[PDB]
C-alpha cells in the first residue's frame with residue numbers, strides 16, 4: 001500500500017463515481033466529505049461504505065487535518081472559490097478538480113495568476129483521453145501511422161442534460177455554457193491529438209428542442225442543445241465538433257475521426273449500458289483506413305469489466321485516479337494541468353461568444 | 365415510345381456516363397456529338413455504339429437540325445459560353461447542363477438575367493439527390509419521421525482531383541474552386557433536405573497535401589484539398605460539410621446525417637466500384653435511430669445491376685434522365701433549375717471568400 005487520505009468537496013453523482021473508482025485502487029482511503037446538502041452526504045456515505053467525517057462546509061474540512069489530497073465534484077461555478085480557499089489555506093494540498101475548471105473569463109483570468117503561485121499538484125479531471133479507444137487514436141496520431149495530421153472530427157450524439165441537485169446544470173450563468181460544461185473534454189482532446197494550439201474559433205448553435213417543459217421560478221433553460229464548432233490551429237491544422245443533445249437514438253454516442261496524409265483512423269464509442277437498452281450492449285470500434293494500399297481494418301476495443309462497471313466513462317475514471325495517485329507520490333506528472341483546463345474553457349467561452357455575435361473569435 | 369434526339373456538347377468521361385444511362389431509357393436516340401478533341405469523339409462514339417454525326421464545334425451542332433435536346437459535359441468555364449449560344453440560337457432547345465453551372469459571380473450574375481428570358485427547359489445536372497439511399501433520407505426528412513429537422517452533416521472523404529483532358533481541372537481560374545467544383549451538389553442537398561435558404565456561411569480550409577508535384581507553366585495547383593464549412597439557414601436550421609481529398613482509404617466516400625427532434629437518420633455511400641478494391645462490392649446502408657423507444661433500424665439499399673454499372677454515382681444519373689425526359693416532353697417539371705444551380709455556386713463562392721478573408725459571409 002502506502003496510504004493516501006482523500007477528502008471530497010462535493011458529494012453528488014460524480015463524487016460517487018470517484019468513490020467507486022477509488023475503491024478499486026489500493027492505498028486509497030476517504031476520510032472527509034463536504035456537502036451543503038445532507039441528502040447528498042447520506043447517499044455518498046452509504047456508497048463509500050465505511051465511517052468518514054462529514055462537514056457541510058469545505059473550509060472546516062481544509063483545516064481538519066484528515067486529508068492528504070482533495071477531490072472537487074461540486075457545481076461548476078463553485079470551483080474557483082473552493083480553489084481560492086485551498087490556495088490560501090496554510091496546509092497546501094493536492095487537488096483533483098472536476099471540469100470545467102472555470103465558468104467565466106474573469107475566473108479564468110484570476111485562476112491563472114493564483115495557480116502559478118501554488119506549490120501542490122492541481123489536476124483538472126478531463127479523463128476522456130484514457131478511454132481505451134481514444135488512447136489508440138492518440139498514440140496512432142502521435143506515432144506517425146496517419147502521416148502528417150491535418151483534420152480532426154468529433155461528433156457527440158447523446159441524451160438531454162440530466163436532473164441534478166438544485167438543478168444547477170440548467171443555466172449558462174451557472175454552467176459556463178453547454179460548450180464549456182459538456183465540451184471542454186473535446187476541446188482539450190483536440191489540443192492533445194493535434195499537438196497544437198488554437199488560433200481561432202467559430203460556431204453555430206441553438207436551443208431548439210430540450211428542457212421546454214421545465215420552469216425554475218417561471219424560467220426556461222437558456223442553454224444550447226446543438227452546435228457545430230470549427231477550430232483553426234497555429235500550424236494550419238483544423239478541427240470540428242458536432243453536438244446534439246437530442247440524438248440518444250445513436251448506438252454510438254461519440255465518433256472521432258482523424259485524417260492525415262498517409263491514412264485515416266476513426267473510433268466509435270457506444271452509449272453507456274446504464275443509458276441504453278439492457279442486453280443491447282455494444283462494443284467500441286476502431287477503423288484504420290490507409291491510403292497507400294487500399295484496405296481498411298476494423299477491430300473491437302475491450303476494457304476491464306470491473307473498471308468499466310466502476311463508472312459511465314468506459315473505465316477512464318480509474319486510470320485518471322492512477323495518474324493522480326502517482327503525482328501525489330512524485331512517481332508521475334500532472335497529465336492535465338490548470339493550463340490545459342483553462343485553454344479548454346476559453347475555447348468553449350470563445351465558441352459561446354461566436355454563436356451569440358455571429359463572428360469568429362481570436363484566441364491568445 | 366416517342367423518340368427524342370439528343371445532342372452531346374462535350375464528349376469526355378461524364379458524357380459517356382450520360383450515354384450509358386441514356387442507353388437504358390427507351391425513346392432515347394443520340395444524333396449529334398460535339399468535341400474539339402477527336403480522341404474524345406472516337407471513344408464517346410465507340411461507347412454509343414451506333415452511327416451519329418460529329419462536330420468539332422457546338423455552333424455547327426446547334427444549327428444541324430438533328431437534335432430535340434442538349435446535354436453539356438464540357439469543362440466548367442465553357443458552360444456559360446455554350447449556354448449563351450444556346451440561348452441566342454434561332455432554334456431554342458432544352459438543355460441539361462453539368463455542374464457547376466457557373467465558375468464566378470460575374471457569370472452567375474450574367475447567367476441569372478439571360479436564363480430568365482429563355483423559353484426552353486434548363487436543368488442543372490446535380491443528380492446526387494436521386495441516389496436511392498439519399499432519396500430515403502430526403503423523404504424521411506420531408507415526411508416527418510425525424511420530427512422537426514435541425515442539423516445536417518455531410519462528410520466526403522475521397523481521392524485527389526483526377527487527370528482530365530488538357531488538364532483543365534487544376535486551377536481555380538478554370539474550376540471556380542474546389543468548393544464550387546466538387547461541392548455544389550452538397551450545398552444544393554442542404555437546401556433540398558432542410559427546405560430552407562442559407563443566411564450565412566463560414567469555412568476553414570487549406571491546400572495541405574495534394575498536387576504539390578504537378579506544374580503548369582512552372583506553377584502549382586492553387587486549389588483547396590480539405591475544408592470545414594458551416595451554413596446557417598433562415599429558420600434556425602444549420603448544416604456542416606467536411607471534405608478531405610486525401611481520404612481515399614475510407615470504405616464509405618460519403619456520410620450524411622440528419623438530426624431532428626424525434627429521430628436521427630444516417631446514410632453511408634460506398635466508393636464507386638471503378639475506384640475501389642476489385643471484389644469488395646459493399647452496399648450502401650441507411651440507419652434510422654429514433655429517440656422515443658431506443659432501437660436503431662439498419663438496412664442495405666440496393667440499386668439495379670445495370671443502373672449501377674451505368675455510372676459512378678450509385679444509379680443516380682439514370683433517374684436524372686427520367687426527369688429530364690419528362691421536361692423535354694413538357695410532361696414534367698425541371699426539378700433542378702438554374703436558380704438552384706446558382707445558389708449552389710454562390711454558396712461555394714461564398715465559402716471560398718470566407719477561407720480567404722477569415723470571416724463568415726452573408727447570403728441573399
Ligand SMILES: NC(=O)c1ccc[n+]([C@@H]2O[C@H](COP(=O)([O-])OP(=O)(O)OC[C@H]3O[C@@H](n4cnc5c(N)ncnc54)[C@H](O)[C@@H]3O)[C@@H](O)[C@H]2O)c1
Nearest residue numbers: 010011012013014037040073074076078098099100164165
Ligand atoms: N468528469 C466527468 O466526466 C464529469 C461528468 C459529470 C459531471 N462532472 C462534474 O461534476 C460536478 C458536479 O457533479 P455532478 O454532475 O454529480 O452533480 P450533482 O448535482 O449530482 O452533485 C453536486 C453536489 O454538490 C453539492 N454542492 C452544491 N454547492 C456546493 C458547494 N458550494 N460546495 C460543495 N458542494 C456543493 C450539491 O449539494 C450536490 O450534492 C460538476 O463540476 C460537473 O461538471 C464531471
Ligand SMILES: NC(=O)c1ccc[n+]([C@@H]2O[C@H](COP(=O)([O-])OP(=O)(O)OC[C@H]3O[C@@H](n4cnc5c(N)ncnc54)[C@H](O)[C@@H]3O)[C@@H](O)[C@H]2O)c1
Nearest residue numbers: 374375376377378401404437438440442462463464528529
Ligand atoms: N457527377 C457529376 O455531376 C459529374 C461527374 C464528373 C464530371 N462532371 C462535370 O463534367 C464536366 C467535365 O467532364 P469530365 O469530368 O468527363 O471531363 P473530361 O475532361 O474527361 O471530358 C471533357 C471533354 O470536354 C471537351 N471540351 C473541352 N473544351 C470544350 C468546349 N469548349 N466545347 C466542347 N467540349 C469541350 C474536352 O476535350 C473533353 O473531351 C465538368 O463540368 C464537371 O464538373 C460532373
